[PDB]
Amino acid sequence: AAAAALAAALAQAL
Secondary structure (H helix, E strand, O other): OHHHHHHHHHHHHO
16 A cells, blocks of 8 residues: 555656
8 A cells, every 4th residue: 555655656746
């Protein structure tokens, strides 16, 4: 859950 949250958060941030 958490690892995926981060993956996505970063993807958007870029």
